[PDB]
């Protein structure tokens, strides 16, 4: 069974920075795309980008370029999303979505999801 | 303000038949047939409902149902369930190479 398990949430103050883990189970980690998805409080699903577990290699959407990291450690299975020179408008809940083959635009099982508040 | 365009809520009684519309444009919605569907119950993850426009994956009931027309998809759900009582989203691939979602409708079961 597939499954995508996020690390607790986070309490931080403005300009820290923040490592939330989304570790991957059920499948082949490195066969399938690892897409990243904001939801600050009461608002809507945003893309924030994707990470290639190919080749590591990420991509940004324009909204979320400049603060934001996308890595991997494959040997654990776990993709990582650091947030930096974290504001107020950052809190919100960060999902990671795993990308359906072929193609990856369509996310078919979605991490529980990790909120961050910046207090 | 996002990409696609969703009504902010609808409503149905048990049993009766609802359907929630996702209007783009044809550099998403309607150049392409990668429109999915998610529901949320608020407070959880995300779980897929609808993929490649009309595509239902393992477990979901038929009574989801998805189509398109023009620049224009919707998602149908019929013989209406208390816990279908939730927020439904809908999301497109891009000619751009993103992903883009609706700003979600509100499904109250009365």
């Known amino acids: 069974q597939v499954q995508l398990v996020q690390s607790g949430s986070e309490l931080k103050k403005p300009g820290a920075s923040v490592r939330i883990s989304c570790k991957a189970s059920?499948?082949?980690?490195?066969?399938?795309?690892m897409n990243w998805v904001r939801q600050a409080p009461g608002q809507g699903l945003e893309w924030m980008g994707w990470?290639?577990?190919?080749?590591?290699?990420?991509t940004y959407a324009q909204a979320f370029t400049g603060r934001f990291v996308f890595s991997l450690d494959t040997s654990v299975n776990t993709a990582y999303l650091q947030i930096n020179s974290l504001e107020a408008g950052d809190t919100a809940v960060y999902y990671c979505a795993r990308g359906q083959p072929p193609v990856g635009w369509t996310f078919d099982y979605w991490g529980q999801g990790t909120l961050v508040t910046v207090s | 303000q996002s990409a696609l365009t969703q009504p902010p809520s609808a409503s149905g009684s048990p049993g009766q038949s609802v359907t929630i519309s996702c209007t783009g444009t044809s550099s998403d919605v309607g150049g392409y047939n990668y429109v999915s569907w998610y529901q949320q119950h608020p407070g959880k993850a995300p779980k897929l409902i609808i993929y490649?426009?009309?595509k239902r994956p393992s477990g979901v009931p038929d009574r989801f149902s998805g189509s398109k027309s023009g620049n224009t998809a919707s998602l149908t759900v019929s013989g209406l369930q208390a816990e279908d009582e939730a927020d439904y989203y809908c999301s497109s691939y891009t000619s751009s190479s993103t992903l883009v979602f609706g700003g979600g409708t509100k499904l109250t079961v009365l």
């Open positions: 490649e426009v009309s």
């Open positions: 990470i290639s577990t190919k080749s590591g290699d990420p």
């Open positions: 059920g499948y082949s980690f490195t066969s399938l795309s």
